[PDB]
């Protein structure tokens, strides 16, 4: 397996020993926040750090495209004719203290998120599709009617009843049902409003995974030891330590071999890591898309709809396409990215093999000729004196709300401005400078939207159900440019239709959607990304493969 020129796995030629201690770190300049309950946890650092303990007690295995498979802590089955998910817990799934994992423990997860008393921020409207749950959530019902237990609370089966099936329900991270358990018997006597701060969820939790946290140092570390009661295969290792390391201290740690594995390392550091003897640098395709938006209208909050009513040359498809073809993304990436940004052909990242295809053609290749032609034949005639094109007497001049963040943010934006000059388009930065992130979010997300930009950039970390509704639908607030297209609406609907319960059909729907978006060019896909992970050469069985379900059990060291 490769990801770009990166290997996904480190095939160590040396056998693992019995036992050993593995030293892992997460790169963060901010402290970890321990919270073992998924619903109550808001810290991304700690979520990752919880991996050896079961990842906040996730239940389902998946394939390498995040499609549910059988064989994890539990199984999930979907029955369309009855509108039901059936979650079947393993006969021998236990908590770390030996107690059984039961049907109640799954239901309890729902309570942690849905009952406001716990203070979760993790409710979503998707959950209102489960029967009874909105009513539980607003306090109208004392219980969640659509969640029933075929063999009772202390049984191993839960049935979840929906108002409508959704084809994304076969993908992990779909959000229509939840994927974790909480130890009801361990936590039942904790007042909901105290749950998040309790030892029992923070420093002294119960977990279901291969390791359990023997010690937790607030903000800093976990000491993992084997969890005797884990259902799967006994780990090779005796222990794992998992610590936060600052961005500034990371490279040093690798040089001294203080950590065998450092996760979360940033792209700008790669050139420093690449040459470290002692390490194998793995890579993997990220759940990420960056793109260019064009400003085409406004958002009507009251009526929850985007109206594509803005006066701008960008209303011309030819102009939208031309500004895309003019960019040199591939060139930019080759200069700056160290291989970790690669040109997107489409809006769905290639890690989603079941949802896209490299056959879809976008703006991944600069074509200045085509760009100049498109503009030519749309009446934007070059004004020889000025070096910029005009139509009906007005210059083709736009504002680019480029933003800070990327090590080479300033330089990249300048490159694009110059490319655009080449095709007779005059482009300037929003107020002559890059926008700060928080200013950019505000600018983009505040209804009804601003009229004082034309082009901007956005980037998303996608969930493992790569839903486009919330980014690009007519009703989405996050449709920053505010386009509204019947064909696009149709396409998006088809993707989430009953027909799309069939994977082949869904694939084709995703593909058509991607094609249509590139053609219409309301937005333009920019980059896909790779993540990297340095691994000490003594590590055995390490891999970034997203279908690898037992790495913490399999992983070892050769000495």
């Amino acid at each position: 397996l490769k990801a770009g020129n990166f290997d996904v796995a480190y095939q160590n030629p040396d056998k693992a020993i019995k036992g050993g201690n593995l030293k892992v770190a997460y790169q963060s300049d901010s402290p970890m926040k321990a919270q073992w309950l998924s619903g109550l946890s808001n810290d991304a650092t700690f979520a990752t750090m919880s991996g050896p303990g079961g990842g906040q007690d996730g239940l389902f295995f998946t394939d390498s495209g995040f499609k549910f498979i059988k064989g994890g802590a539990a199984d999930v089955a979907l029955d369309k004719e009855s509108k039901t998910a059936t979650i079947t817990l393993r006969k021998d799934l236990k908590w770390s203290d030996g107690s059984e994992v039961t049907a109640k423990d799954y239901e309890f997860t729902y309570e942690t998120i849905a009952n406001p008393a716990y203070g979760s921020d993790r409710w979503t409207d998707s959950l209102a599709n489960i029967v009874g749950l909105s009513d539980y959530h607003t306090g109208k019902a004392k219980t969640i009617s659509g969640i029933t237990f075929p063999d009772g609370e202390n049984g191993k089966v839960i049935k979840v009843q929906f108002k409508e099936m959704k084809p994304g329900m076969t993908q992990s991270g779909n959000g229509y049902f939840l994927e974790t358990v909480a130890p009801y018997q361990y936590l039942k006597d904790v007042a909901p409003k105290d749950l998040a701060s309790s030892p029992k969820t923070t420093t002294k939790p119960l977990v279901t995974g291969p390791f359990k946290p023997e010690n937790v140092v607030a903000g800093e570390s976990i000491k993992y030891v084997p969890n005797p009661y884990y259902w799967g295969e006994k780990p090779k290792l005796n222990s794992i330590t998992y610590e936060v390391v600052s961005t500034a201290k990371s490279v040093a740690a690798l040089s001294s071999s203080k950590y065998d594995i450092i996760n979360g390392m940033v792209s700008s550091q790669y050139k420093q890591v690449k040459n470290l003897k002692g390490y194998k640098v793995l890579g993997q395709q990220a759940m990420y898309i960056s793109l260019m938006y064009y400003n085409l209208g406004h958002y009507d909050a009251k009526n929850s709809i985007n109206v594509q009513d803005r006066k701008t040359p960008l209303q011309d498809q030819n102009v939208r396409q031309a500004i895309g073809y003019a960019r040199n993304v591939a060139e930019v990436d080759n200069k700056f990215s160290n291989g970790l940004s690669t040109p997107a052909n489409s809006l769905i990242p290639p890690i989603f093999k079941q949802f896209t295809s490299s056959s879809v053609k976008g703006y991944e290749k600069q074509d200045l000729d085509k760009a100049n032609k498109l503009l030519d034949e749309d009446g934007w005639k070059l004004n020889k004196s000025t070096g910029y094109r005009e139509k009906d007497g007005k210059e083709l001049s736009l504002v680019y709300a480029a933003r800070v963040g990327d090590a080479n943010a300033e330089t990249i934006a300048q490159n694009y401005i110059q490319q655009w000059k080449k095709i007779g388009v005059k482009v300037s930065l929003y107020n002559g400078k890059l926008m700060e992130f928080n200013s950019w979010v505000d600018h983009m997300t505040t209804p009804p939207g601003a009229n004082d930009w034309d082009i901007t950039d956005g980037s998303w970390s996608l969930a493992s159900e790569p839903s486009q509704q919330d980014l690009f639908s007519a009703a989405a607030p996050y449709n920053f440019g505010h386009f509204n297209d019947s064909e696009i609406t149709k396409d998006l609907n088809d993707i989430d239709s009953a027909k799309s319960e069939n994977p082949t059909y869904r694939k084709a729907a995703f593909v058509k959607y991607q094609e249509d978006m590139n053609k219409k060019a309301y937005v333009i896909p920019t980059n896909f990304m790779l993540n990297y992970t340095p691994v000490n050469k003594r590590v055995v069985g390490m891999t970034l493969d997203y279908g690898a379900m037992n790495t913490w059990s399999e992983i070892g060291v050769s000495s």
Partner: peptide, 5 residues
């Protein structure tokens, strides 16, 4: 769901 980033 997705997140800025």
């Amino acid at each position: 769901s997705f997140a800025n980033g």
